[PDB]
Design a protein around this ligand. Structure first.
Ligand SMILES: N#Cc1cc(Cl)cc(Oc2ccc(Cl)cc2OCCn2cc(Cl)c(=O)[nH]c2=O)c1
Lengths: 551, 406
């Protein structure tokens, strides 16, 4: 008996409606509920019910410091209500919106109260206004419309709005309507007056279905404060960032901080958050005080300077190409912009994941491309052209020798250093006239003491003692020792599957300082060939250095 | 017609899987396909009271797009209905035949109606761009392709339609896995393709529309190969010693003593060591132990199949199928003679391995893919042609076992 058709709702199988008792309230708060309810009753939103209804749900009356508002705690009913199709978890990104001649923002008043609720489900919405000091029975009501705070209200409203919009959307194909919560965002490339006429039509079309909308004098005007953004007619930017200054930082303080910095990364180029993020590694409690690293202090200072200036993003033109450009900012940190025209950026972003203890630059550049690809698909529905500071010779060599399959987009080389390059390449065949080191390392797991040694074809032998290490860390330090005491060309032979795997991956940045030192040596060297042999199998050079390090 | 009652395993809820973002090209193609599928009554729009979801993809099997539904989750939650109950048994002879042709018979399912209670579980979503719209929500009214209960429900009709043809040809083996028929014969090639065309026309005259053959006789477990140099270096012997030591876990009896002896001392890797007569025999003897096949390796039907893939460079990709480590039911190599790229070759290799696995055991293996998760999730449909989808995970550790299987 409502124009809008209801969605059938069921409780989770085997559950009944909520039977929560109502807490007593003031005679003044009861006065607020009684008046609000008779208005809601007059409006058909709610109905008084007989005594046979066995369900209840608490109701409260609050006000802010001033007409009162009614509040219903549906927590128990929500637990017993079936699941619904998930409403929009994500929201549109301003850089994905297409530029429109005119844009109108309409909010729906009493949105949920304008949609009928399934008849068979209404019994479970019963609530009670308390009588003064239990002097009499309370007044039993139930809901006939979507209650605010009920589990199913957002999804059923959105679907009801969709169907209500379908007739108008047919008779007006050029008008574009976006839905979000109780809002409609309408855009046309028609004349401001013509567009203004169409808006007024949609308002009446919604009013005929019962949906209140604002008039031309009460409609919001640009700039729109929408979900932490500023939407101007020809520009978007984030709302102002306020990074606090503090003498001491809690874990929660840093999590707020990286969040705001992450938020600034979409339009502010060059934001970095790695050093600050490392502080939260193993962050036990939110109240735990974290001493700031010198690196985190510099990172935060660098962020403050970038934020001092103001930046804006532009809206999207489907007719112009989409181009993405990546720049390296520092060891492990990358930055990108996406643009259709040279200096008009649609959005910016960063990528700074190590994805492991050790990595190389070409691998990280490929990962940054992958992250942009996923992001472009989400926002614009396609992948962009890539302008990258790497040469085809560099990338081709890497992706050919790399043991993983990888997709290399179509990209052009842009000579704007720092250019991504391979700092070193291990030899693929052993070296003639280069000394052959047989390295080994050992560590007592209990005492945690160790040693790393080498034996060479030229007869050279050496053992260095190690204080606090592991079998793995010594196997790496043995390779470091051979690199330290070798000429510009060296053949190294290890029995360590661990150390071979780290080196064969050819990293150029690591979070282990020992590996960073091996990396520094590998660069200075002209030719390095690394060989592996099964340990404890009596191979000539491995047996000698094994016996040497074991003594 | 009469619907067959379908139930999920008791105490099991429907699928609630995330729909992947898609390019505008694939979205438009999905809206065209689904608009006409809706006109034909095969799917219907659903309301918010349906919370279930199954991902959908747009591929090409080709100027025309086609819809592919990833029913992997719904299949896991329906396994009582398509296995144990209404299970289709797997013939052990299909692998033995000399030619096998694969026939897409999936269009049959859209005649049969689906249990009205079970329809809510087939819900899928055509995604929007940039979350500008709520997705378009449908559920299936007929037996959907990709759901393992569809061939199980249709199994009776298929046996009936094939009963005359199997009568006329008693030595031809026909096996159905999901949306496809596998037809095997020991006949001559041109004679085999004639029988395939006969069966096709038989199917078409009974209303089952159908749109490169396999040869399982050639397949086998590859034997480990050892090099043959005219002059061996210290480094060459070391790698030869390491490869034989790795194989000592699978084949017992490989000896390295005479080979290790040639490396006694602290020699330069580049030094040229002559192959002594005693070591040449050990290398020669070990070349014969690798010729013989392993023993004790039996397929357990209760256990998952596992497929590992290594990139060997130059378009070559080795692979091993097993259930317990170092017990390889099948090994093999794939070769792309192509315009190609790494993702295209891996995608093609995965389909070859899965088809081989379907022929031999009647189920798809679980893949350990040497690729980054998000890269595979972005481009795997660009070359995906099969109507099924195997399970996969992403191996981030490199194979130092790359040159072993090389
Ligand atoms: N608040 C708010 C808000 C939220 C969303 Cl999700 C969209 C929105 O607006 C549009 C709505 C529909 C379309 Cl089709 C384009 C829009 O904008 C495109 C970009 N733009 C924005 C403004 Cl403000 C403008 O004056 N001119 C213009 O070209 C408004």
């Amino acid at each position: 008996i409502s124009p809008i058709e209801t969605v059938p709702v069921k409780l989770k199988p085997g559950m009944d409606g909520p039977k929560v008792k109502q807490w007593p309230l003031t005679e003044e708060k009861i006065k607020a509920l009684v008046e609000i309810c008779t208005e809601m009753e007059k409006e058909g939103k709610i109905s008084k019910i007989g005594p046979e209804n066995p369900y209840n749900t608490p109701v409260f009356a609050i006000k802010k410091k001033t007409k009162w508002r009614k509040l219903v705690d549906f927590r128990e009913l929500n637990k017993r209500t079936q699941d619904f199709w998930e409403v929009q978890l994500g929201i549109p990104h301003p850089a994905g919106l297409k530029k429109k001649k005119s844009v109108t923002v309409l909010d729906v008043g009493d949105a949920y109260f304008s949609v009928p609720l399934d008849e068979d489900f209404r019994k479970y919405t019963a609530f009670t206004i308390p009588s003064i000091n239990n002097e009499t029975p309370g007044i039993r009501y139930q809901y006939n419309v979507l209650p605010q705070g009920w589990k199913g209200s957002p999804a059923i409203f959105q679907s009801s709005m969709t169907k209500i919009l379908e007739p108008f959307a047919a008779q007006n194909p050029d008008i574009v309507i976006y839905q979000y919560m109780d809002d409609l965002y309408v855009g046309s490339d028609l004349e401001i007056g013509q567009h203004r006429t169409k808006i007024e039509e949609l308002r009446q079309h919604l009013l005929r279905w019962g949906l209140t909308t604002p008039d031309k004098k009460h409609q919001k005007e640009p700039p729109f404060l929408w979900m932490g953004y500023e939407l101007h007619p020809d520009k978007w930017t984030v709302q102002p960032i306020v990074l606090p200054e503090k003498d001491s930082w809690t874990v929660n303080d840093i999590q707020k901080l990286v969040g705001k910095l992450n938020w600034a990364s979409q339009i502010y180029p060059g934001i970095k958050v790695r050093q600050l993020s490392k502080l939260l590694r193993g962050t036990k409690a939110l109240t735990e005080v974290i001493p700031l690293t010198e690196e985190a202090e510099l990172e935060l200072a660098e962020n403050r300077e970038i934020l001092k200036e103001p930046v804006h993003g532009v809206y999207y033109d489907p007719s112009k190409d989409l181009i993405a450009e990546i720049q390296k900012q520092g060891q492990g940190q990358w930055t990108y912009q996406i643009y259709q025209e040279p200096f008009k950026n649609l959005k910016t972003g960063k990528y700074a994941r190590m994805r492991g203890a050790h990595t190389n630059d070409v691998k990280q550049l490929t990962e940054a491309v992958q992250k942009i690809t996923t992001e472009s698909i989400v926002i614009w529905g396609k992948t962009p052209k890539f302008k990258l500071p790497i040469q085809k010779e560099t990338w081709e060599t890497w992706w050919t020798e790399y043991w993983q399959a990888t997709w290399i987009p179509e990209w052009e080389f842009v000579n704007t250093p720092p250019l991504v390059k391979l700092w070193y390449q291990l030899e693929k065949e052993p070296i003639v006239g280069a000394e052959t080191f047989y390295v080994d390392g050992a560590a007592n797991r209990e005492t945690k003491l160790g040693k790393a040694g080498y034996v060479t074809n030229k007869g050279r032998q050496k053992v260095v003692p190690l204080t606090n290490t592991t079998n793995q860390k010594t196997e790496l330090q043995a390779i470091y020792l051979a690199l330290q005491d070798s000429g510009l060309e060296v053949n190294i032979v290890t029995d360590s599957q661990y150390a071979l795997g780290i080196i064969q991956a050819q990293p150029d940045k690591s979070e282990s300082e020992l590996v960073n030192q091996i990396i520094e040596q590998l660069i200075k060297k002209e030719k390095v060939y690394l060989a592996w042999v099964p340990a404890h199998k009596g191979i000539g050079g491995n047996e000698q250095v094994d016996k040497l390090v074991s003594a | 017609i009469e619907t067959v009652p379908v139930k999920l395993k008791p105490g099991m809820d429907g699928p609630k899987v995330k729909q992947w973002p898609l390019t505008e090209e694939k979205i438009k193609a999905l809206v065209e396909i689904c608009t006409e599928m809706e006109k034909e009554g095969k799917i219907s729009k659903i309301g918010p009271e349906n919370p279930y979801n199954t991902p959908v993809f747009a591929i090409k099997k080709s100027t025309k797009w086609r819809k592919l539904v990833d029913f992997r989750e719904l299949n896991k939650r329906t396994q009582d209905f398509w296995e144990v109950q209404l299970g289709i048994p797997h013939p052990a002879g299909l692998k033995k035949k000399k030619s096998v042709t694969v026939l897409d018979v999936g269009d049959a399912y859209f005649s049969v109606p689906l249990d009205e209670d079970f329809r809510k579980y087939t819900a899928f979503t055509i995604p929007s761009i940039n979350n500008e719209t709520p997705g378009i929500r449908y559920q299936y009214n007929v037996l959907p392709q990709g759901w393992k209960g569809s061939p199980a429900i249709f199994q009776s009709s298929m046996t009936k339609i094939l009963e005359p043809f199997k009568k006329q040809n008693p030595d031809i083996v026909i096996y159905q896995y999901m949306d496809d028929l596998y037809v095997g014969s020991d006949l001559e090639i041109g004679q085999h393709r004639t029988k395939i065309e006969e069966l096709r026309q038989h199917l078409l005259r009974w209303g089952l529309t159908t749109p490169y053959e396999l040869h399982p006789d050639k397949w086998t477990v590859q034997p480990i190969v050892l090099p043959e140099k005219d002059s061996w270096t210290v480094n060459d012997i070391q790698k030869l010693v390491g490869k034989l030591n790795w194989a000592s876990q699978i084949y017992p009896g490989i000896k390295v003593r005479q080979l290790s002896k040639l490396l006694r001392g602290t020699k330069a890797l580049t030094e040229v060591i002559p192959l002594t007569e005693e070591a040449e025999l050990e290398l020669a003897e070990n070349r014969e132990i690798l010729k013989e096949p392993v023993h004790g390796v039996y397929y357990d039907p209760s256990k998952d199949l596992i497929a590992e893939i290594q990139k060997q460079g130059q378009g070559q990709w080795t692979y091993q199928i097993y259930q317990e480590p170092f017990k390889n039911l099948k090994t093999g190599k794939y070769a792309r003679m192509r315009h190609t790229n790494d993702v295209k070759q891996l995608t093609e290799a995965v389909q070859k391995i899965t088809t081989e696995s379907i022929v031999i055991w009647g189920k798809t293996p679980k893949f350990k893919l040497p690729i980054q998760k998000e890269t595979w999730e972005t481009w795997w449909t660009e070359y995906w042609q099969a109507t099924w989808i195997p399970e996969w995970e992403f191996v981030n550790t490199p194979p130092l076992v790359k040159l072993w299987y090389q």
